[PDB]
């Protein structure tokens, strides 16, 4: 504070007090001027020291308001993200096989573990070594889960394409050896 009502009173009080001190009139003049400048600094104390809690509290409030606004924007952002994800993953399951197996239930309830088994259009097989490959995904087509699948594309642990003519018993020690087969459901 520099331009509040107490300042003018205090300043003029001490100016007149010290002008009269330069005059040097009495002994009660000193007492009176010092009492005035004791009670006028008792005005510049409340008005210049406790006036400053108001500003600090207002700044507390302003920072809290800023924080609340930011926290309110983040919620809308994450809500939009979640509902976009839900709607984008919805656009793949609304097929005609799902409707079939749901209309074959007696209440509309089915176990979840059978939904990929009877409706998924693509299958992925992970093979550790050659004997397991020879027992499961042999040739161009194979049978699994009461269905028949046809192979397209084989990769290795480095994600590099392997041809079906390289997977032999002699060339086995030269392959990165988890193999990942991708197959499509045959009609």
């Amino acid at each position: 504070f520099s331009s509040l009502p107490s300042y003018a009173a205090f300043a003029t009080a001490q100016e007149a007090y010290e002008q009269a001190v330069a005059n040097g009139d009495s002994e009660v003049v000193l007492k009176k001027l010092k009492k005035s400048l004791n009670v006028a600094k008792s005005e510049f104390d409340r008005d210049a020291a406790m006036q400053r809690k108001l500003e600090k509290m207002a700044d507390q409030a302003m920072t809290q308001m800023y924080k609340q606004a930011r926290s309110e924007d983040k919620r809308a952002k994450v809500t939009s993200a979640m509902q976009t994800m839900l709607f984008t993953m919805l656009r793949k399951l609304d097929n005609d096989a799902l409707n079939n197996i749901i209309n074959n239930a007696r209440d509309g309830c089915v176990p979840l573990n059978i939904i990929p088994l009877t409706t998924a259009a693509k299958l992925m097989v992970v093979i550790p070594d050659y004997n397991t490959y020879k027992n499961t995904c042999d040739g161009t087509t194979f049978t699994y889960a009461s269905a028949l699948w046809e192979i397209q594309q084989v990769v290795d642990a480095d994600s590099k394409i392997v041809q079906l003519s390289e997977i032999s018993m002699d060339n086995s020690p030269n392959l990165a050896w988890p193999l990942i087969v991708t197959a499509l459901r045959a009609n």
Partner: protein, 585 residues
């Protein structure tokens, strides 16, 4: 939170007691709050005294209370007034310049949009203030249209005839063809799905959506929307090209469109096409003409109603191949001759009500007269192509306004584009018309038709006119002439070949009753767009300004290839427009 409209500086406050709670800055908010009586502001939390069961909602009598804002008799020992310094305590209190001239937004807020100065300010103010005024108009109409009564049908008299019942406290609005009802069918759980209908007095005659059974207890209600704020203005700040950009001229000339070749280059170098075109001058023929100006171009067809997109379509079955074309309909009764739920294509017809968001080249607008500041701006708020057409004219009737009771809106302040043909000037017009003989061209030119247009083929000398005064006894918002429909009774049967014509009346009650003696089809000039007939009848009924004025008269006269009847009661446009006059029987 974000920037305010009047200021474009960031803010966090709301005019709570005001209509549409717009963003206002600190100084902005103080001017709007102290100049007029909206005295409730909303921060990230509302400015409300949290004392248990308090009642104060004012801004200048509430004080701070530490964490909260506290009432005077409930405020803590030492507080800090929330509204001083000429500012309201909010975010970004430093970077706010404010404004002094606040009379504009104040008047826009406190108005009820019932008289002419309302729209005067709605037009002459700032363009973003025009967006705000359009949304304010829409909100006022939505809150005033549901405030009317509910149609509680309890009888079943016949098909297209029933009996109405309405509850206490609400009158029943004008049973007009301007505002469509909406019904829902009763069941034990809910009540839904009858559709949109249009009622009037009979017995009560109804214009039904589609044939079904009329149950008991179903309500018919003027249901409102949930309208949203706007983003883009009415039109883009304009510009003339240095080249034919995004386009390349054709190679041949067309017989149907050799009358518009001079209009090809004139907008090939700019965005908008401000058109001054009387009804039926080749108004829609250019929509297919400029369409094949360059068939590879992306042309956006807007519509006023599905009737407007039909008038856009009713000719597109021949000159247009349907290899890739569509029109939009959200989940009713109309023409759907093209693809459904197809948006980004060679051509998409659309009514603005459900247009998707894409980017295109050409935009063929349907007549601008109906379009307000809202609906015209919606199109470029969702589809921002970068050269436009604005086919249409203030030469005809706009979409009616509900409570426009005081001085009627002037023929210049319809919307944005409609002002700059008599402020800047028009560039588009066909020097040819398509129906009008000599009686409906040259004398009409002394009107707002600019002394500009000729006839298609020459005089018929068959338009009729009378000399009478009229007697009327009127219902809630309708008016029927017992004598003036009795004098046309003498004109019809005693002219045996006269009865190809359709008699028109803004008070369709006249056409409701004239079918009891004559039976001719009913029609009003509320939707005189699309109706283009050989023989027509019309009368003046009351001599007041509801139908006598320019956009109210001329919507009906420009109709015939041969002639129409003109039954006048007043002498203004009797002295203005002159036709064949005879003796009165």
């Amino acid at each position: 939170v974000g920037a305010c409209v009047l200021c474009n500086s960031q803010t966090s406050l709301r005019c709570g007691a005001c209509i549409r709670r717009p963003f206002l800055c600190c100084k902005c908010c103080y001017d709007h709050v102290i100049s007029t009586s909206h005295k409730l502001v909303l921060s990230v939390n509302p400015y409300v005294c949290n004392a248990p069961g308090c009642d104060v909602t004012d801004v200048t009598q509430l004080y701070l209370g530490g964490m909260s804002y506290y009432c005077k008799s409930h405020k803590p020992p030492i507080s800090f007034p929330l509204c001083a310094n000429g500012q309201v305590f909010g975010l970004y209190k430093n970077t706010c310049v404010g404004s002094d001239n606040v009379t504009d937004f104040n008047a826009i807020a406190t108005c009820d949009w019932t008289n002419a100065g309302d729209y005067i300010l709605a037009n002459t103010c700032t363009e973003r203030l025009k967006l705000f005024a359009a949304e304010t108009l829409k909100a006022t109409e939505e809150t005033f249209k549901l405030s009317y009564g509910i149609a509680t049908v309890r009888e079943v008299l016949s098909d297209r005839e029933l009996h109405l019942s309405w509850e206490v406290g609400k009158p029943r609005p004008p049973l007009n063809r301007n505002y469509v009802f909406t019904g829902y069918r009763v069941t034990k759980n809910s009540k839904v799905q009858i559709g949109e209908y249009t009622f009037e007095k009979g017995a009560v005659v109804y214009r039904g959506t589609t044939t079904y059974k009329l149950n008991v207890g179903d309500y018919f209600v003027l249901t409102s929307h949930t309208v949203m704020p706007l983003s883009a203005p009415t039109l883009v700040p304009q510009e003339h090209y240095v080249r034919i950009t995004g386009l390349y001229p054709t190679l041949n000339i067309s017989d149907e469109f050799s009358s518009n070749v001079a209009n090809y280059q004139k907008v090939g170098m700019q965005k908008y096409s401000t058109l001054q075109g009387p009804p039926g001058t080749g108004k829609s023929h250019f929509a297919i003409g400029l369409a094949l100006y360059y068939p590879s171009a992306r042309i956006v067809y807007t519509a006023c109603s599905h009737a407007a997109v039909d008038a856009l379509c009713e000719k597109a079955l021949k000159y247009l191949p349907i290899d890739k074309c569509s029109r939009i309909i959200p989940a009713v009764e109309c023409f759907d001759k093209f693809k459904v739920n197809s948006t980004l294509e060679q051509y998409v017809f659309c009514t603005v009500n459900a247009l998707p968001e894409t980017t295109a080249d050409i935009v063929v607008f349907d007549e601008i007269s109906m379009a307000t500041n809202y609906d015209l701006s919606v199109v470029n708020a969702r589809l921002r192509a970068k050269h436009y057409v604005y086919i249409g004219d203030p030469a005809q009737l706009p979409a009616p306004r509900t409570l426009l009771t005081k001085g009627t809106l002037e023929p210049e302040y319809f919307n944005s584009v409609c002002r700059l043909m008599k402020t800047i000037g028009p560039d588009m017009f066909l020097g040819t018309c398509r129906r009008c003989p000599a009686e409906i061209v040259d004398t009409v030119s002394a009107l707002v038709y600019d002394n500009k247009l000729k006839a298609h083929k020459d005089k018929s000398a068959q338009c009729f006119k009378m000399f009478y005064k009229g007697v009327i006894t009127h219902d809630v918002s309708s008016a029927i002439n017992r004598p003036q429909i009795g004098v046309v009774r003498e004109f019809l049967t005693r002219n045996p070949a006269w009865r190809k014509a359709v008699f028109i009346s803004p008070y369709n009650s006249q056409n409701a009753v004239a079918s009891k003696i004559l039976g001719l089809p009913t029609q009003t000039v509320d939707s005189s767009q699309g109706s283009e007939y050989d023989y027509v009848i019309f009368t003046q009924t009351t001599e007041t300004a509801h139908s006598c004025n320019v956009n109210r008269f001329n919507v009906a006269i420009t109709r015939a290839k041969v002639g129409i009847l003109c039954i006048m009661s007043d002498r203004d446009l009797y002295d203005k427009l002159q036709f064949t006059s005879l003796e009165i029987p």
